[PDB]
Amino acid sequence: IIYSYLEALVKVFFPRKRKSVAGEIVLITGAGHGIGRWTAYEFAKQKSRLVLWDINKHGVEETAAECRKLGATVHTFVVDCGNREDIYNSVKQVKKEVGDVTILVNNAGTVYPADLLSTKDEEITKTFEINILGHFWITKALLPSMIKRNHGHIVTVASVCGHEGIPYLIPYCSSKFAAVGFHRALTLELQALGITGIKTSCLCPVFVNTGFTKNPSTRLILETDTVARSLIDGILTNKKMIFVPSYYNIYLILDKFL
Amino acid sequence: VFFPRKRKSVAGEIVLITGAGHGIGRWTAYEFAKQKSRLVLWDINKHGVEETAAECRKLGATVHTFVVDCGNREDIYNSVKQVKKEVGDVTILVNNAGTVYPADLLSTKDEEITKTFEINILGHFWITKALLPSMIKRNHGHIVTVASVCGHEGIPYLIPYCSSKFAAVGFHRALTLELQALGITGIKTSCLCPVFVNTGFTKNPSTRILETDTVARSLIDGILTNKKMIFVPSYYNIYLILDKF
Ligand SMILES: NC(=O)c1ccc[n+]([C@@H]2O[C@H](COP(=O)([O-])OP(=O)(O)OC[C@H]3O[C@@H](n4cnc5c(N)ncnc54)[C@H](O)[C@@H]3O)[C@@H](O)[C@H]2O)c1
Ligand SMILES: NC(=O)c1ccc[n+]([C@@H]2O[C@H](COP(=O)([O-])OP(=O)(O)OC[C@H]3O[C@@H](n4cnc5c(N)ncnc54)[C@H](O)[C@@H]3O)[C@@H](O)[C@H]2O)c1
Ligand SMILES: O=C(O)c1ccc(NS(=O)(=O)c2ccc(Cl)c(Cl)c2)cc1F
Numbered sequence: 008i009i010y011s012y013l014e015a016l017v018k019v020f021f022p023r024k025r026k027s028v029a030g031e032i033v034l035i036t037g038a039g040h041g042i043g044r045w046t047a048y049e050f051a052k053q054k055s056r057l058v059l060w061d062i063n064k065h066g067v068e069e070t071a072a073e074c075r076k077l078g079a080t081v082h083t084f085v086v087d088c089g090n091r092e093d094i095y096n097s098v099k100q101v102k103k104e105v106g107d108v109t110i111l112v113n114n115a116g117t118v119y120p121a122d123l124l125s126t127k128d129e130e131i132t133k134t135f136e137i138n139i140l141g142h143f144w145i146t147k148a149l150l151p152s153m154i155k156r157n158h159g160h161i162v163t164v165a166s167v168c169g170h171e172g173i174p175y176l177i178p179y180c181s182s183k184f185a186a187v188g189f190h191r192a193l194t195l196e197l198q199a200l201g202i203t204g205i206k207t208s209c210l211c212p213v214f215v216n217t218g219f220t221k222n223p224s225t226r227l228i229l230e231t232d233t234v235a236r237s238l239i240d241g242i243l244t245n246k247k248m249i250f251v252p253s254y255y256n257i258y259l260i261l262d263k264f265l
Numbered sequence: 266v267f268f269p270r271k272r273k274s275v276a277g278e279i280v281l282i283t284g285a286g287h288g289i290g291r292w293t294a295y296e297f298a299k300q301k302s303r304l305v306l307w308d309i310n311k312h313g314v315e316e317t318a319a320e321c322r323k324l325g326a327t328v329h330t331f332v333v334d335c336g337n338r339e340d341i342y343n344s345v346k347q348v349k350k351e352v353g354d355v356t357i358l359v360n361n362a363g364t365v366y367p368a369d370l371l372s373t374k375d376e377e378i379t380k381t382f383e384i385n386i387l388g389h390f391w392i393t394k395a396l397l398p399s400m401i402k403r404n405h406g407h408i409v410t411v412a413s414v415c416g417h418e419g420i421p422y423l424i425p426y427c428s429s430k431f432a433a434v435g436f437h438r439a440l441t442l443e444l445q446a447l448g449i450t451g452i453k454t455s456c457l458c459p460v461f462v463n464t465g466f467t468k469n470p471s472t473r474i475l476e477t478d479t480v481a482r483s484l485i486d487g488i489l490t491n492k493k494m495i496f497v498p499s500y501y502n503i504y505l506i507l508d509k510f
């Protein structure tokens with residue numbers, strides 16, 4: 008309420024400059040539904056060339072048909088973004104068919120809500136493999152070309168779960184904290200290496216009504232199109248930590264004072 | 266001094282310390298041996314863990330050692346069966362075992378990234394899932410996660426390690442909240458986050474120098490007072506608060 012009217016005031020008197028992403032080759036994982044699908048529509052309206060990845064073939068082709076109706080060029084690939092071998096083989100395919108990815112959006116995610124003793128060890132493994140390990144394989148495959156050209160943008164889709172824990176979501180919160188840490192260390196390392204042209208953004212939304220989980224963990228709801236608008240607005244202005252809603256940054260700051 | 270925290274006793278508790286064969290794990294073992302606890306020491310380095318145990322026995326403590334790969338789920342479960350049969354139910358778990366392979370992202374080997382996660386965070390899940398049930402049954406336990414300042418702030422050339430350390434802090438925070446949500450009042454949690462400790466784990470600090478024994482003293486003092494987030498040095502909490510501004 009107090010931050011909501013103060014930030015809207017700061018966005019007019021002190022606006023951040025918007026860059027263009029037209030013609031960029033944007034790779035979005037988990038583009039077959041929810042945040043990934045609606046982020047794809049935002050980049051299609053930005054006149055980007057899209058590469059969409061997902062284990063759900065039907066859904067990613069449905070996202071691609073809608074992006075093409077928006078005027079964009081789109082290539083889809085069925086890729087398990089938690090499988091290292093599949094990711095590397097698919098990067099070879101993208102280079103051969105599309106070119107060098109310039110903007111990577113690591114959005115694919117998985118969750119198996121349960122208290123620690125009711126979890127399956129395979130679900131814990133899959134949570135890490137997709138929510139953080141997969142970011143490493145995809146980033147390692149696409150970063151060389153971005154470094155060579157001094158031009159890229161690594162977007163990590165994490166969660167408020169990457170900043171604060173939640174009961175019954177221990178393995179998921181842990182993998183989301185791992186995603187925030189990967190974004191922070193990546194940001195610092197690129198800067199230490201003198202690589203000025205590669206930007207980084209972390210998207211941390213609260214509960215989004217996508218069916219990913221059933222209900223919010225608190226007495227809080229975000230729509231998918233709002234989160235995609237927040238993400239694209241943050242990417243175009245090179246915002247490093249994007250909270251949706253942005254006022255959640257003060258709740259997290261107050262937690263570090265108790 | 267004006268507001269002191271009460272110190273509990275850990276005498277006779279069964280304390281399991283992973284990575285007890287050297288550094289923080291070894292000197293934490295000596296602290297618990299002086300506290301009159303029943304120690305269970307785990308490490309992939311047999312020679313080093315038995316060397317820690319001989320020194321713990323000279324301190325008056327009863328000690329059991331096991332050679333366990335704390336990044337291997339099957340090895341951890343089989344070893345927990347052995348600990349129950351030979352020692353009993355662990356009451357205090359110190360998830361200290363860790364690994365690091367310093368390099369820029371494009372110089373990391375995918376196997377090193379995998380091993381970093383398997384030992385620094387996945388192993389905490391398997392060990393905690395094996396030991397937490399008896400703690401819940403008895404409404405009495407203490408889960409200690411040895412993380413790092415790397416679990417709060419990133420560092421160049423340590424991306425996979427920082428990511429696994431952030432995962433460890435997150436596991437500690439979601440565990441604390443879940444135990445509380447379930448009405449489990451008797452199980453305490455502590456997170457140890459030291460800056461560079463001179464143990465040989467890494468060659469030099471990443472920024473512009475703790476001694477092993479100081480970190481072990483800070484850890485035991487935090488456990489005995491039920492401190493949830495232990496920073497070594499403690500003042501390195503205001504540096505993290507200033508970063509968020
Ligand atoms: N929905 C929320 O409340 C919420 C909040 C914060 C963050 N997030 C994060 O946002 C991201 C997207 O969530 P969503 O709500 O849009 O989810 P969703 O269920 O709508 O879709 C996620 C997509 O990822 C795909 N995916 C899953 N496993 C995959 C794999 N191995 N390889 C490739 N693709 C895979 C699924 O097929 C699906 O199309 C996730 O990382 C999630 O953790 C979600
Ligand atoms: N040393 C530092 O600067 C520093 C700073 C902050 C946090 N930490 C953390 O403290 C912990 C201990 O670090 P240290 O400096 O005492 O290290 P160390 O190198 O002195 O000893 C770590 C011990 O863990 C054991 N270990 C490694 N892999 C294992 C495995 N798979 N199974 C079982 N044991 C295994 C090693 O054999 C070794 O005895 C680690 O988790 C580390 O990340 C270290
Ligand atoms: O990532 C998810 O799928 C996800 C699930 C549940 C959720 N619960 S919430 O919206 O009530 C909420 C709001 C603020 C905070 Cl600090 C926290 Cl931890 C939680 C938030 C999520 F991001």
Ligand SMILES: O=C(O)c1ccc(NS(=O)(=O)c2ccc(Cl)c(Cl)c2)cc1F
Binds near residue numbers: 418459461466471472
């Ligand atoms: O875990 C390690 O092995 C480890 C390695 C290097 C290190 N560098 S440091 O002590 O200069 C330092 C001081 C303040 C901050 Cl915030 C950070 Cl991230 C780092 C700290 C470590 F914990």
